[PDB]
Design an enzyme around this catalytic site. Structure first.
Site, PDB file in Angstrom:
ATOM      1  CG  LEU A 176      -8.440  -6.502   5.957  1.00 40.59           C
ATOM      2  CD1 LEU A 176      -9.870  -6.442   5.445  1.00 40.59           C
ATOM      3  CD2 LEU A 176      -8.319  -5.799   7.294  1.00 40.59           C
ATOM      4  CB  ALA A 180      -5.440 -13.339   4.575  1.00 44.51           C
ATOM      5  CE  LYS A 181      -8.871 -11.467  -1.587  1.00 45.74           C
ATOM      6  NZ  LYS A 181      -8.356 -12.202  -2.776  1.00 45.74           N
ATOM      7  N   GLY A 182      -5.539  -8.646   0.808  1.00 43.92           N
ATOM      8  CA  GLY A 182      -4.882  -7.361   0.864  1.00 43.92           C
ATOM      9  C   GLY A 182      -5.158  -6.562  -0.394  1.00 43.92           C
TER      10      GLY A 182
END
Lengths: 960, 155
Positions: A145, A187-189
């Site tokens: 994201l 952001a983050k994954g």
């Protein structure tokens, strides 16, 4: 079967998105409508097949009309909703790797990647990220994201394969706040393995399978990430689209992977995968790993948190560098945070420090010997508290193990810990809890997990079972200062309760941001040098030498940024009580427009705000930090949408982001950076918020009625004209010399009042939009020439009050020149009107300033301005009214200056000019002056009396 | 006028009474016509048309409702009243400075609003929002008074 894989991946994404119907219902609906499934398959294939682009115009209307004419014919509600969801998913799809056939890609390894636009998906819960990447494979499944084109974040090796996107979406908000000071956007994954590791009953074989299977899945997940991501080629300087990839969105090439709970040791693997794909970022694709900066040798995170600790101690009047103080710590002399943080001051007296394995207790620690032993322990490659020298320990103290049933308690330890007087032995859990609740100056955090909770918070909602037995209450902790060197040490509500308990605390993302900042800066440098590598300016084997050379300067720049943020937080804390209403208005504005969630960001509710208002207390320090971060993010979003980074007057500070060596050697590459606009935006918003304050732009929006862009223009003009940055740096330097924080805070508040009034003056008296360079070049030189000679024309009460304030400032150690410059800020504001008047009457500014301030003393406008400053600001309308009467007074004196200088001769001073003006007045002016005299004699200073006084001054002017 | 005539008051006398506050403005109209050496008919037409354009009657009525419990509040309320009247006088100077005498009040207002600036647009929007708010304390009326003032260049 491949198209079935595509549909299966879309169904799995819907399950991740929180779609109500399960997978069985989805496949049943698809099976009962094979023609519809054929239509959607044809739609997706024709959209994303590159061969279709070679077959003329794509069948857009035909496929869309066929799908729509089949959807509307459905009668079942569940079938209609399911097929509508898939249709919307196909419409929202931006990129895919279904048609790439190169052997090295993840497609040959059975990995499907989708780049999606979350803004147009109905079933997606709020918030909707800017870009999403969904990677599906029979072995691994992951999501990523991003909220912006330039984004950064970590990758979770999560185990919640049922719904991990909820976890990622929960963490992305904290990550976005964490990146307030750095260039990229939060952001983050997160990826999860689908087949669990081999269950064999042997711990040695099990843990090996977990790591071995994780790397292969981690390689695949990043490989899918790089299939749809663009690349930057320096052969032409443009962005190239991967082959066999049909785009529907714009261009997107920035992608940075950060280590996380399951990726800390995967940095080199990620860099190797990026090398295989030939990514432009190269070794900068992952933070550190094997090429970069020795964060253990740097200790940048510990120094960053130590800046906040030092600021809190200076607010307490205690200098950590010259006064002994007691510390309770979490960790040992082997980790980065705790290890580097416990060696920054020789006056540290570590009374107690627990860890995950053992507990260290020292009732009456020394300073030199304790520092020497701590340094010796830090010198070992690995150590624990059991390696502490038992000959240097104080009487009654020692090192104990956390696994023992009970530990005897010495009277010295009890006296130095502030416990119940009847205890003689304790258990490690109760010992840790007692350590957490101690009358100790500093509470250093360098461990992992949450150890402090709020009174109303639940244990399960924290999300940490390991510390669930040792979690304490924020209002119960007796520490004066809490330094959060680690992540998630205290919950947000715990921070609020602790600050409401009298303790000093800031948000962790404000303390340990240095480690992130140093990670960003290095990346921002690794790109630049890579550009110089392609240009031939940097020798390839000298590149690593250059990075190792600039390590100290990188640390210094990051420390300077943290110092700026800490100083701003201190000033905001000083002015927290008087700005509660404005802060509430800012919260309402952000909630209404930027979609901020108060409970998610721990911002107070309206009832809490009014309760604090009735209690006479402002926002808490962590709450102020949260609001400051959100304002910084909003300002960044506003500036990026504008052309300010494009203009040179704002881009002149671009080289200052980089070290001096790059500043000199690399100039064209700096001017042609790929992330130039974002760096300019970050620098502008950081400087603006740090100097002008949190509520500068918002108050500008309410008062003037313009966008934040004009506020940025105004602040840049004022900073360049009056040298506000130099004055602020001088104030901070004086505070570093021994001046108490109260005097420096008052000085910064007066300077902020100056910049507020001056920026409003430019917005109200100059054509819009402001030509920043034009006003700078037509005001700054004259202001710099007239500022030092200020003592030449102040008269009477003005000179008296300035002398009083300058003497009061210098009485606390402030330099006399700086004290006098601070005390004249409100009068340095009038030089703008003086220069404007001189421009109109085409006369020298010296005589104009002389007559202007002489007339100000003649009417006693300083007392009226001070009384206007005392007016209530409980609502918005009273604020607009008080700024109205203030600007009315200033404009009236401007008109009187026109009238006075319209007669006389330049050689005449202010007193003679006033005398000859009063000579040729009329009964109207005589009545007005008598009315002001009677008003001063009355002493009433409400809105009505000041208003009638304002017209008296107005009535002295013919043009009114 | 209808309410007055409903009690037996003659219609001519009732209308003459109901226009007293507007008959007061004829003094400013005559002064303006003397300054611009023009006929008072067009001056009065444009003046009252501009008064309807800004809705100054509502502001004057709200000013009349201000408290007079002490002397200073009375001086302040007469101050804001005279400030509004002088501001409309200056706006009349600005409007009649352009155009042609045959144009009526509406056309003169239209062509004046045509050649204004963002300053005047912001001021008019502020007055519109002030009317929408409905608050009629001293502070709101005061900021409304400068909005009307800010519509004039000579201020």
């Amino acid at each position: 079967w491949q198209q079935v894989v595509v549909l299966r991946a879309y169904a799995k994404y819907l399950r991740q998105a929180g779609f109500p119907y399960s997978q069985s219902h989805i496949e049943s609906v698809l099976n009962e409508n094979p023609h519809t499934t054929r239509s959607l398959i044809d739609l997706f294939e024709a959209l994303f097949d590159p061969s279709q682009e070679t077959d003329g115009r794509r069948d857009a209307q035909g496929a869309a009309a066929a799908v729509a004419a089949d959807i509307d014919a459905l009668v079942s509600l569940d079938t209609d909703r399911v097929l509508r969801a898939f249709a919307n998913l196909i419409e929202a799809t931006l990129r895919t790797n279904y048609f790439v056939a190169r052997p090295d890609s993840a497609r040959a390894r059975n990995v499907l990647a989708f780049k999606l636009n979350p803004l147009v998906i109905k079933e997606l819960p709020l918030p909707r990220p800017k870009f999403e990447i969904f990677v599906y494979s029979p072995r691994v499944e992951g999501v990523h994201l991003r909220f912006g084109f330039v984004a950064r974040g970590g990758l979770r090796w999560s185990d919640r394969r049922e719904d991990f996107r909820t976890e990622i979406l929960g963490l992305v908000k904290a990550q976005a706040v964490k990146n307030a000071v750095i260039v990229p956007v939060g952001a983050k994954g997160g990826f999860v393995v689908k087949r669990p590791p081999t269950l064999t009953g042997d711990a040695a074989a099990d843990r090996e399978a977990t790591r071995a299977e994780g790397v292969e899945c981690y390689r695949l997940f990043i490989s899918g990430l790089l299939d749809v991501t663009d690349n930057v080629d320096k052969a032409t300087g443009a962005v190239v689209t991967p082959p066999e990839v049909v785009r529907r969105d714009g261009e997107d090439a920035y992608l940075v992977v950060a280590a996380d709970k399951g990726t800390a040791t995967f940095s080199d693997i990620a860099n190797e995968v990026a090398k295989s794909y030939g990514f432009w970022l190269g070794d900068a694709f992952a933070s550190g790993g094997s090429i970069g900066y020795d964060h253990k040798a740097m200790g940048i995170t510990a120094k960053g948190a130590w800046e906040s600790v030092k600021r809190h101690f200076r607010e307490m009047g205690v200098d950590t560098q010259t006064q002994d103080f007691t510390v309770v710590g979490i960790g040992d002399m082997s980790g980065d945070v705790f290890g580097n943080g416990m060696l920054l001051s020789k006056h540290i007296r570590l009374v107690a420090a627990f860890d995950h394995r053992d507990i260290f207790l020292d009732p009456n620690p020394d300073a030199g010997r304790s520092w020497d032993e701590r340094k010796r322990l830090f010198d070992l490659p690995r150590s624990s508290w059991a390696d502490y020298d038992k000959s240097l320990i104080s009487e009654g103290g020692g090192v104990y193990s956390r696994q023992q049933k009970s530990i005897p308690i010495s009277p010295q330890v009890r006296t130095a810990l502030g416990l119940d007087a009847d205890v003689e032995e304790l258990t490690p859990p109760a010992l840790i809890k007692a350590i957490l609740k101690a009358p100790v100056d500093l509470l250093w955090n360098g461990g992992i997990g949450t150890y402090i909770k709020a009174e109303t918070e639940a244990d399960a909602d924290v999300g940490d079972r390991a510390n669930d037995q040792i979690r304490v209450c924020g209002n119960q902790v007796r520490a004066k200062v809490i330094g959060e060197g680690g992540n998630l040490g205290v919950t947000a509500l715990g921070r609020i309760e602790f600050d409401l308990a009298g303790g000093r605390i800031n948000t962790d993302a404000l303390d340990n941001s240095a480690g992130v900042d140093c990670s960003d800066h290095e990346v921002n440098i690794k790109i630049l040098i890579d550009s110089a590598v392609t240009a031939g300016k940097v020798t390839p084997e000298e590149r690593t030498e250059l990075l190792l050379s600039m390590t100290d300067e990188v640390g210094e720049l990051v420390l300077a940024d943290n110092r700026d943020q800490n100083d701003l937080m201190g000033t905001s804390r000083a002015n927290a009580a008087s700005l509660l209403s404005v802060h509430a208005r800012m919260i309402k504005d952000l909630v209404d427009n930027r979609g901020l969630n108060r409970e998610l960001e721990a911002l107070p509710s309206e009832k809490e705000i009014r309760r604090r208002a009735d209690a006479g207390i402002g926002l808490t320090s962590p709450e102020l930090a949260t609001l400051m971060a959100h304002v910084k993010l909003a300002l960044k979003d506003d500036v990026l949408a504008s052309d300010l980074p494009d203009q040179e007057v704002f881009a002149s500070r671009l080289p200052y982001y980089f070290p001096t060596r790059l500043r000199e050697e690399l100039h064209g590459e700096i001017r042609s950076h790929q992330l130039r606009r974002e760096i300019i935006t970050t620098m502008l918003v950081n400087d603006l918020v740090d100097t002008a304050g949190i509520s500068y732009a918002y108050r500008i929006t309410e008062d003037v009625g313009v966008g934040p862009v004009d506020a940025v223009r105004s602040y840049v003009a004022i900073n360049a004209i009056f040298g506000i940055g130099d004055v602020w740096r001088r104030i901070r330097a004086a505070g570093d010399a021994g001046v108490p924080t109260s005097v420096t805070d008052r000085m910064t508040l007066d300077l902020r009042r100056l910049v507020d009034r001056a920026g409003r003056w430019l917005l109200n008296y100059r054509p819009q939009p402001l030509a920043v360079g034009a006003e700078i070049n037509r005001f700054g030189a004259k202001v710099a020439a007239l500022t030092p000679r200020m003592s030449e024309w102040l008269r009477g009460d003005d000179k008296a009050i300035v002398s009083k304030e300058a003497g009061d400032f210098a009485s606390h150690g402030v330099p006399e020149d700086l004290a006098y410059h601070i005390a004249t800020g409100l009068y340095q504001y009038s030089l703008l009107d003086v220069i404007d008047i001189a421009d109109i009457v085409d006369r020298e500014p010296d005589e104009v300033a002389d007559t202007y301030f002489a007339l100000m003393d003649h009417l006693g406008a300083d007392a009226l301005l001070t009384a206007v400053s005392r007016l209530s600001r409980d609502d918005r309308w009273h604020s607009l009214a008080r700024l109205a009467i203030r600007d009315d007074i200033y404009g009236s004196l401007r008109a009187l200056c026109f009238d006075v200088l319209a007669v006389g001769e330049p050689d005449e001073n202010g007193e003679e000019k006033i005398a000859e003006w009063e000579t040729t007045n009329s009964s109207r002016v005589t009545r007005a002056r008598r009315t002001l005299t009677e008003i001063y004699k009355d002493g009433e200073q409400d809105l009505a009396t000041l208003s009638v006084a304002a017209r008296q001054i107005r009535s002295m002017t013919r043009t009114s």
